[PDB]
């Protein structure tokens, strides 16, 4: 198991922990704020996913300071993990291309 693949895996597992923790913390953060809609766990988990992927449809989003803070972590964990998968694929291509060049 090469490093880039161990990191990709680690990244995926971690991102999933951030999606769950984040969903739990968003709801906890948003309740108490009138008009808040990021207030039930199931859709909160869905919200976290569309936030981690950066899609952000606009159906759900935090309105509180702490909920938005939770959001930032989720966004960054999402952008960073996927990016780390991109970098792991680049490594795979570079090394195979090396072998192919007989370097």
């Amino acid at each position, epitope marked *: 198991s090469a490093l880039h693949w161990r990191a990709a895996g680690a990244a995926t597992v971690l991102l999933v922990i951030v999606l769950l923790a984040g969903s739990y913390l968003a709801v906890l953060a948003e*309740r108490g704020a009138p*008009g*808040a809609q990021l207030i039930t766990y199931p859709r909160a988990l869905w919200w976290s996913v569309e936030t981690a992927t950066t899609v952000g449809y606009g159906d759900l989003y935090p309105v509180t300071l702490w909920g938005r803070c939770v959001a930032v972590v989720v966004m960054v964990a999402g952008i960073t993990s996927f990016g780390l998968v991109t970098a792991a694929l680049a490594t795979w291509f570079v090394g195979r291309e090396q072998e192919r060049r007989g370097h």
Partner: antibody, heavy 118, light 106 residues
């Protein structure tokens, strides 16, 4: 079987305060929220507030004067709602319900009848 | 905060007839409306969740519909056990709110 247990009644002298209990059973999830609903005789349901025992955080209906204070004892699976300095206006049946974090009240207690008089 | 309006406070129906309870939301709330039944001296009982999702242990006689601002709780072929106060409640925006309620009269 009976999931939420509330004592039948509580008498309270005007101005005094009381703490109602709500012992829970059945499944318990860290995602559970315990709610308190006030129902005056001949009136509908009124939401007082909520609490996430697995964290201790509570929120209150900001549309009504805050006469309550929610707390929970994670070990005794007991949620308590403290009503402070009551008046005849506070006399009513107070139910507690368990919400799995999905928006609806799956189960309710029998409710405690609170009466404020000397 | 979302206001829920329950059309007529009382509904008169003949035995076995079909009855529909209306619950209007002051704004668009998807299908995040839940119905409760409460008989005299009783605690509220969940009848329908998320506007139309049935709850086991509840007669198939009960069904709900609607989305957005208008929701309906229906009882197909009403019977005496059904005499009670029916409430709708929303979980779309905090804080959760209840409708004033509608009494079923046979």
């Amino acid at each position: 079987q009976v999931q939420l247990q509330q004592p039948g009644a509580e008498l309270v002298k005007p101005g005094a305060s009381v703490k109602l209990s709500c012992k829970a059973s059945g499944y318990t999830f860290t995602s559970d929220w315990i709610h308190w609903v006030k129902q005056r005789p001949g009136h509908g349901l009124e939401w007082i507030g909520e609490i996430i025992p697995s964290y201790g955080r509570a929120n209150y209906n900001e549309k009504i004067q805050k006469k309550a204070t929610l707390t929970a004892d994670k070990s005794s699976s007991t949620a308590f709602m403290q009503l402070s300095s009551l008046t005849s206006e506070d006399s009513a049946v107070y139910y507690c319900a368990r919400e799995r974090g999905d928006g609806y009240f799956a189960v309710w207690g029998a409710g405690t009848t609170v009466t404020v008089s000397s | 905060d979302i206001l829920l309006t329950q059309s007529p406070a009382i509904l008169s129906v003949s035995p076995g007839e079909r009855v529909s309870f209306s619950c209007r939301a002051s704004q668009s709330i998807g299908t995040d409306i839940h119905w409760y039944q409460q008989r005299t001296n009783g605690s509220p009982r969940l009848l329908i969740k998320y506007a139309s999702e049935s709850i086991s242990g509840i007669p198939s006689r009960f069904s709900g519909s609607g989305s957005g601002t208008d929701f309906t709780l229906s009882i197909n072929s009403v019977e005496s056990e059904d005499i009670a106060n029916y409430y709708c409640q929303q979980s779309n925006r905090w804080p959760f709110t209840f409708g004033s309620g509608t009494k079923l009269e046979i």
